[PDB]
């Protein structure tokens, strides 16, 4: 299954949108649109496939204190959706450290089994995948433990994507890596990284009251 990003241009670069049974990783500097894309996907996944969704629910793990329910309400209202229904279909959790981030995947798996209902979870967002690891290993970047912990976290994410047929979307400041940046005139640009046999070009997108869109 594929979830639309809200932007026809970015969807075309991604082959239709982000895939289930896969980890899509968006990386870029602060202000590049990573969190806004996550918020938009959390609404789009709820739509029927003809409208870019998978008739599903979204799970959002926030490690940077940047999750905004009022933004989901605005995206829903500006796409003609009931905002209260959209908020009821998004489960969110703040992760305060890397241990908590991993523990929340066990709770996520329990919620996913229970939802297997007319609106199963189809999207898991981790925004961001590495913020806690970077802060916890300041002055200790050479320690193998940091890479080993991240490897265990990614292994669990792949297991969830495959067992529940869910798209995993992670941000970084990977089945598929996407780089976001700003060009001339504040143009927002996305391109694929280390993706042989996939589009090599760039896609321009915008951030508006509807979230991500052309």
């Amino acid at each position: 299954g594929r979830i639309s990003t809200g932007s026809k241009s970015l969807d075309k670069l991604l082959g239709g949108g982000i895939e289930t049974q896969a980890i899509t990783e968006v990386f870029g500097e602060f202000g590049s649109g990573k969190t806004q894309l996550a918020h938009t996907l959390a609404v789009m996944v709820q739509l029927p496939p003809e409208e870019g969704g998978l008739n599903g629910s979204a799970m959002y793990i926030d490690t940077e204190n940047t999750f905004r329910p009022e933004r989901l309400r605005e995206i829903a209202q500006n796409r003609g959706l009931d905002p209260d229904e959209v908020l009821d279909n998004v489960a969110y959790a703040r992760a305060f450290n890397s241990n908590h981030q991993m523990q929340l995947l066990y709770q996520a798996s329990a919620m996913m089994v229970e939802s297997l209902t007319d609106r199963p979870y189809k999207l898991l967002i981790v925004d961001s995948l590495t913020s806690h690891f970077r802060s916890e290993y300041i002055g200790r970047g050479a320690l193998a433990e940091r890479q080993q912990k991240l490897a265990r976290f990614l292994r669990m994410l792949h297991r969830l994507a495959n067992e529940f047929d869910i798209a995993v979307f992670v941000t970084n400041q990977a089945t598929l890596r996407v780089y976001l940046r700003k060009g001339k005139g504040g143009k927002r640009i996305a391109r694929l990284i280390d993706a042989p046999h996939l589009p090599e070009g760039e896609a321009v997108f915008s951030i508006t009251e509807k979230g991500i869109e052309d």
């Binding site: 989901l72 709770q107 919620m111």
Partner: peptide, 28 residues
């Protein structure tokens, strides 16, 4: 216990038993 809530603010709970089952299925 810091876990998940709906974006509307409703705490979503996972039983100790359901938690243990998930850890058992995915920890090994």
């Amino acid at each position: 216990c810091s876990g998940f809530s709906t974006a509307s603010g409703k705490k979503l709970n996972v039983s100790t038993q359901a938690c243990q089952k998930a850890v058992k299925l995915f920890s090994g």
